[PDB]
Amino acid sequence: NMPREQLGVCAEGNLHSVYLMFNANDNVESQLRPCIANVAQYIYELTDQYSDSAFNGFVAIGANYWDSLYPESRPEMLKPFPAMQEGNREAPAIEYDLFVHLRCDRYDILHLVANEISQMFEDLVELVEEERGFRFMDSRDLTGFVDGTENPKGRHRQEVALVGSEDPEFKGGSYIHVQKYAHNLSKWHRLPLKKQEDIIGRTKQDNIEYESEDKPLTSHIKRVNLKDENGKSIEILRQSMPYGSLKEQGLMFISTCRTPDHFEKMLHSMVFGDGAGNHDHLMHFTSALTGSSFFAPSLDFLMQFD
Amino acid sequence: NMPREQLGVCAEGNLHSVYLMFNANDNVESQLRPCIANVAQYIYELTDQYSDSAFNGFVAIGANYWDSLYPESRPEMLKPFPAMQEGNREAPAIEYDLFVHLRCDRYDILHLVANEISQMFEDLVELVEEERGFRFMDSRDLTGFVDGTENPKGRHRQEVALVGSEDPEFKGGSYIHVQKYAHNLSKWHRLPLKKQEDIIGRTKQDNIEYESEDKPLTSHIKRVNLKDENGKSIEILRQSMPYGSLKEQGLMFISTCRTPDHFEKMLHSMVFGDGAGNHDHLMHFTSALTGSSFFAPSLDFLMQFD
């Protein structure tokens, strides 16, 4: 298995993270492609340098810019963010050329690395968005509920997240989708505890999954636990973290997967619901401000250039 | 000594911090004064609740708003930020009604506390500025030099920072000045090491103070180490931390002192220099974007209301 996946795609959780969205200047693709190689490599190398603080990271590339940078070849299923909307439940698409996802248990080291990576890009791209993620309590979303529990574990993570020999040229790569969710915390926190629990489908403190028969059809976990046309579970590996500040704060939702339709099917099920009009009531409490599709290739793919 | 100083004024350093600047709505002083009491108290109480992560904090009150909130009485020496400027060396004044200074070795807890404090203010004030500070490496400024070394230590901190029986009514309070310094890091980091060291007056890595005779008259430490009309050292207790992000980043300079002219004399010496036109060359590398004067009273002063 010659291609090497970037280490931050499947990494276990961290106390802190940085999210950097760049858009490229006109006609710079000849110069960026090798510069992206250096950055990808550096990010990999930093895993070992900063092992002490579990550093890890990845560089991913926007769906709408792939063909300016990599015109000769393409991931089989790559496409733009799947915009959708019903009522107040809006999932907009806002694409960026490049995404740099950085993680560590030390914040000072991410500040340093970010500064460094920014200098690596020279005057070839513009920084468009920057946000900083943080672990909240014992891996909780700012809603006060534990986020992460039913994620793939150990080697299953690789199985779920990484492209394999279905697409030989891009094996080691992952399909990435990012939604910046701005929570309405004042509205949420006026809910009685039982309502909160009924919206997620788990108890808050102890984080105990409801029994099947007890899960409401409008609950987050009922809506995003799907099975394929053959009964098999349809999974993703999420890497999301709380983010923001008083002005604006919520979840930086990140999906990683060997196929892009897993996230889409889940999102459809959340916005549009089950078919008897049972949608995801969690969506009454937060708003997705962005929606971006990327591909994060293997290191080896990124490096074959200049 | 009945008045109790707020615990965050003299606190030892922390890994993280939040800085919140609020301006009050029209004619709300009757309602704010007791609400400020609750907030001050809460911040104190949180020192014990979150001892595990060395939590501490203070609420301070702008020079230009003191008399709307506390018309009956005033700190003896309280006045606006001492604006000054020569050449490109600008120290502007931008005052805010209230400052909430929060600190902790855990960032998640500060996010929570900030959210909470914001809700305490209701619709009586507007949030105007928020920034987050962080320890960089072994307590270094983003210049790569250790910041803090010659600060007062142990009980001397209290001696330097806190008003005493010179002003009985406000004993336990401190005079606070805040400058948001935006560093030009690209410019700084093109300096050869010896130049950097010559600008600060200490060696970078080992942080060794230059000998007197070797300190250049334009070096930061030469300029801000002053003696009074009787030879005695003129001190302040700084509580500054690195802050910001790629868009903008530098030092959140914070001075705390029992008298406000200490910081002023230092700042004058930095901007205007020694008198043979030897100013502080550090100022060629960073720009002070804000300049705010506050008073942080004792808890007991703040609490005597409604």
Ligand code: HEM
């Ligand atoms: C405001 C944004 C969101 C929040 C606060 C949130 C929160 C949660 C929480 C608390 C859980 C239960 C703990 C766990 O099993 O991980 C969960 C489960 C899950 N979420 Fe979300 N989520 C959000 C958005 C999304 C989105 C947009 C998707 C997909 C497009 C998604 C997919 C999933 C999946 C696949 C599970 C595991 C369910 C299972 O199989 O048991 N989440 N989420």
Ligand code: HEM
């Ligand atoms: C860009 C903003 C600033 C930076 C990066 C900076 C950095 C430093 C550094 C690296 C030191 C030496 C280590 C130490 O003894 O603490 C120092 C010392 C000091 N600084 Fe600054 N400083 C800044 C602004 C200021 C300002 C605005 C003042 C006063 C208005 C000030 C007052 C002092 C004092 C009193 C000392 C101790 C000097 C001594 O007695 O040895 N600093 N500063």
Ligand code: NA
């Ligand atoms: Na490098």
Ligand code: NA
């Ligand atoms: Na409270």
